[PDB]
Design a protein around this nucleic acid. Structure first.
Lengths: 245, 110, 175, 293, 294
RNA sequence: UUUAGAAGGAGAAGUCAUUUAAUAAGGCCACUGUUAAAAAGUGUACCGCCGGAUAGGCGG
């Protein structure tokens, strides 16, 4: 039982779901959190017994699946619908990297082969893995290549002019260009019982809606803390969420 | 995407088993180092890595048991304007040839 | 066997390969010929990452204390004392590595007459190509450049380490 | 932005071919043979190679060039005044006397040669012949016949008694006949000729006087762990040497923290430490503090 | 808006090689020789072999200080400046500044670094002929200004006559001789290197010889200042600038209350009388010239 | 166990015609570039042979 962190370096994904609710481009972070949880479950199916809790995102390159129409606005592309008309979807080519806060025994020069074997049956936000560049276990603060980290900056999200989120989001968005909208977890309702029609009937069912906040990009050289990134799960009385504290 | 030489297939001329043996062909190697990868330099972090497969590459390129003591490893655009660790983008060299081309490549890649 | 340690002094801006290939071996060849060639040389400074290296330390090997006592390199070699430093601390050590002489020079016109005289065969593609390759592998090695005496010319001598800790020696101190 | 200037000015050495006995007269130019790798050698007639260069000596506090603080200048002046009233700038002058005396400036021409002789002349007077083999390399002989007479003028010119000193040094090796001696090359200027070039100025070969400057600057025996290595090192900013590979003063004994504790703290540093600081003050260079980057 | 051209225009110099006895007869050019360092290449110029000394000849042109008064913006400003000029003629005669400038030539402090370690300086000036080698013959000092003699008086009187209104031009030649030494290092003016391919010591050469800039001499000829604050404890004359800031020391000597801004605010626009010490500086500014805007 | 799981963008085309931009103009005056440096690694590598396989080994 020792604390460490693994790095998934330069994972490029085609057709990742970039149309979560309102944000076109960067997907919801719960996609990456559930990807880390699916990797944790895949390693738990094997008898390695290794836990993962904490994930930070480092974006390198992005390609919205489209072009520019006249002046700079984007028009996006889509496949042809078939056997069961198109309604609303978008896709992206991401080239980003993962920091996974890894907590569990027997990590040094181990579990990398298991992660490599179990990664091939995984999709990041519904997109193909293709070829990630490397898996690394270097335990330094300056172990990051030249990328940009998407963190939770609750400064203009919290303190800005405007009475409420709506009359405050766009007003906090004019003066800062790096700051971007981010879907951050999701909670709506109650009645956690066992109503039918579930994907797995032996679980807890709910009717849940996405929630939103702000985010920002900082380089690998200039930074504040590891604790200012590496997003964590959190749970309350029906208010499941992901945050950095 | 990194470039590849346009001639290296097999033992063509001036070569017994992989290594450049005979002389009067290092001008051909110097113009293969030229004529490809000019003016398209990338930053240092925008460079191909040096993998650990290369020891097995020297193992099964032609049948060597390990890295020869009497030979070295070189490419045609080393760490500047393309070049990758493919199955064919390396040419092993001699001491004098490598010493000459370390300044010959830096003559235009100053 | 018995060893004597001799050191060189860096910091003067000149690598001591010239001072050990010209001021040591051409002046030691005469006493090697005179004293029946019973001495060898070695160094524990092997470094073959990319090229040949020598380091800065030399040891003289002799099979008995009488040879190292009657050599007396401290006094007769009092000409390059600003570069070399002597040790009068001869003893027996169990950390000696032996060295042999390997030589492979170019043989186009040196044995072109022999190949046109003794045994002739077609040498176009396969065999002449075997020459320079044989002149390449041993080329990538730590060499020593010395001078002859009969016909004045310099050449390369390659000194390869060996596991044969016992045996006789030659004029170059090797076998 | 503190910066001194050289109190020892160097002129480029020139190679002249010369016969055996007539060393003073019959000097001939030394041309360089361009072979396919420039190199040269002595002919079958002349068997003496001459080196002629000059040293200009100007006083140390008058050699001060750049400062943005009057109090640093005042503290430097007070330290120099205390050094004059304490030592008198005689030992560094004696060490430069020994380094020009023992013919340490030829570098590669010293090895393999025996008959090396130098003559040091002032603007109106000269000095007798020299046996530069008899001196050692790692020591500094400070008790001879004319060493006080040759060092006192340099000490007074460093101090301020004499405004100027001009030294002409002509030295020659003589033992070899038809041997070769190569000057310092002219770097990798143009790569049209891949071979090694040579030094060419005024229709002759010679020597870069930066080589002579770093020859005379090698007197420092005050570095840490002196007993481990036991040789003089050139008086540099860190004392670094690119031959052994280890920087000799990466510690508080290096010049930056030394001058910080000497000026900003007014510490009573010992005699060898202030000897090192006046040696690096004599050498001169850019001594400014690091900007906040 | 106000501007002032140079009341005196010097000549960008050259270097030539002579001997002690062949000082006036035999001459030779002095060429820049390149050098290698460490990397980099430095064009360190040096005095050639088989010499004894060093020639440098340039020329100085003196013109009247009311004729060189450049583009102004007020006729009243011109009348005020001319009124102060004729007052300075009536009470002094524009000759103390001429004496101090000819003493600045007479200590020959335009050589800068070639003065350090120099054996003898010989400045020859030809108003029409060679008066005397006295100029720079007897060694000077930067603590007293040498009065009396005869050459100082006659050249200062002619320079004052050309200064005030009595002439229209004077063209004399500063051919000075610096005995640095046999094949010693000569410092020419260094060109400002603006390329990183060969970022060594780029120097300034004349048309077939080694040169030196005009501002190397002109800014070293305004060294006269004995009328500045804290002179009693500094005891050396700083060169003349606008704010008086000397970059050699780093402490601005002048601009406490005696800079050119205070003189332009208590002169001309408002009429006030200031002493000889507070007028010789403001009349030594006009010989230098510049751009006196705002 | 991730707003998870899935999907055929296609075939075809005529952009064409002529057209005068030009008259007038003051960039200025002055400011020391200097401090200091390691190009050279050994810069080239021959014969007499025994060997008749261009195996491999002694000497100058």
């Amino acid at each position: 039982m020792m604390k460490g962190y693994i790095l998934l370096e330069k994972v490029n994904i085609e057709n990742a779901n970039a149309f979560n609710n309102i944000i076109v481009g960067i997907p919801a972070i719960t996609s990456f959190l559930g990807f880390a949880r699916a990797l944790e479950r895949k390693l738990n199916a094997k008898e390695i017994a290794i836990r993962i809790n904490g994930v930070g995102l480092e974006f390198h390159e992005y390609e919205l699946k489209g072009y520019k129409n006249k002046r700079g606005q984007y028009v996006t592309s889509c496949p042809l619908p078939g056997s069961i008309h198109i309604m609303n979807q978008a896709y992206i080519d991401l080239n980003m990297s993962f920091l996974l806060e890894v907590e569990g025994p027997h990590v040094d020069m181990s579990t990398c082969k298991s992660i490599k074997s179990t990664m091939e049956t995984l999709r990041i936000a519904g997109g193909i893995i293709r070829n990630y560049k490397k898996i690394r276990l270097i335990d330094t603060l300056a172990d990051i290549p030249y990328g940009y980290f998407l963190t939770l900056r609750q400064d203009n999200l919290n303190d800005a002019a405007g009475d409420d989120m709506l009359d405050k989001m766009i007003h906090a968005l004019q003066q800062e260009d790096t700051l971007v909208p981010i879907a951050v977890g999701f909670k709506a309702l109650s009645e956690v019982g066992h109503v039918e029609g579930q994907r797995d009937p032996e679980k807890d069912h709910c009717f849940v809606e996405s929630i939103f906040s702000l985010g920002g990009f900082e380089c690998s050289k200039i930074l504040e803390d590891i604790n200012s990134c590496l997003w964590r799960y959190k749970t309350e009385e029906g208010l499941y969420l992901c945050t950095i504290i | 995407e990194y470039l590849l030489p346009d001639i290296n297939i097999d033992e063509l001329e001036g070569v017994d088993n992989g290594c450049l043996i005979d002389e009067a062909l290092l001008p051909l190697i110097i113009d293969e180092g030229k004529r490809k990868g000019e003016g398209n330099y990338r930053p240092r972090h925008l460079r191909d890595e040096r993998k650990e497969e290369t020891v097995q590459a020297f193992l099964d390129k032609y049948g060597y048991c390990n890295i020869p003591v009497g030979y070295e490893v070189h490419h045609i655009v080393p760490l500047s304007q393309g070049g990758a660790d493919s199955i064919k983008n390396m040419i092993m060299l001699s001491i004098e040839h490598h010493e000459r081309v370390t300044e010959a490549h830096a003559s235009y890649f100053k | 066997m018995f060893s004597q340690i001799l050191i060189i002094k860096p910091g003067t801006g000149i690598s001591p390969n010239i001072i050990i290939s010209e001021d040591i071996f051409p002046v030691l060849h005469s006493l090697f010929v005179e004293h029946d060639k019973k001495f060898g040389i070695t160094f524990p400074a092997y470094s073959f990452d990319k090229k040949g290296h020598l380091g800065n330390i030399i040891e003289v090997l002799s099979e008995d204390k009488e040879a190292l006592a009657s050599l007396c390199l401290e006094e007769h070699l009092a000409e390059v004392t600003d570069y070399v430093k002597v040790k009068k601390e001869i003893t027996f050590t169990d950390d000696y590595v032996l060295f042999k002489r390997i030589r492979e020079e170019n043989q186009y016109e040196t044995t072109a007459r022999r190949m046109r005289k003794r045994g002739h065969t077609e040498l176009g593609r396969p065999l002449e190509m075997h020459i320079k390759k044989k002149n390449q592998q041993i080329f990538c090695h730590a060499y020593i450049k010395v001078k002859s005496a009969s016909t004045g010319q310099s050449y390369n001598i390659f000194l390869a380490p060996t596991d044969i800790k016992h045996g006789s020696f030659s004029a170059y101190g090797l076998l | 932005n503190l910066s001194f200037a050289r109190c020892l000015n160097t002129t480029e050495a020139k190679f002249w071919q010369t016969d055996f006995l007539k060393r003073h007269t019959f000097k001939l130019p030394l041309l360089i043979t361009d072979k396919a790798s420039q190199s040269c050698t002595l002919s079958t007639e002349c068997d003496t190679l001459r080196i002629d260069f000059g040293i200009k000596v100007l006083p140390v506090k008058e050699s001060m060039y750049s400062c943005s603080d009057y109090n640093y200048r005042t503290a430097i002046y007070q330290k120099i005044d205390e050094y004059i009233a304490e030592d008198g700038f005689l030992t560094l002058a004696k060490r430069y006397v020994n380094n020009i005396a023992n013919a340490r400036f030829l570098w590669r021409n010293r090895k393999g040669a025996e008959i090396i002789e130098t003559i040091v002349t002032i603007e109106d007077k000269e000095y007798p012949s020299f046996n530069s083999k008899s001196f050692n390399l790692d020591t500094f002989v400070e008790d001879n016949a004319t060493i006080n007479e040759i060092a006192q003028q340099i000490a007074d010119t460093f101090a301020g008694k004499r405004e100027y000193l001009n030294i002409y040094v002509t030295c020659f090796v003589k033992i070899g006949c038809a041997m070769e001696v190569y000057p310092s090359q002219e770097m990798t200027f143009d790569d049209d000729d891949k071979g090694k070039k040579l030094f060419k100025f005024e229709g002759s070969a010679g020597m870069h006087s930066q080589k002579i400057n770093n020859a005379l600057r090698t007197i420092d025996t005050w570095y840490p762990d002196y007993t481990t290595y036991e040789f003089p090192i050139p008086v540099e900013n860190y004392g670094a040497a690119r031959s052994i590979g280890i920087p000799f003063r990466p510690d508080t004994k290096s010049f930056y923290k030394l001058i910080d504790r000497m000026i900003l703290k007014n510490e009573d540093l010992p005699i060898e430490d202030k000897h090192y600081v006046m040696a690096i003050l004599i050498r001169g260079g850019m001594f400014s503090k690091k900007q906040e980057k």
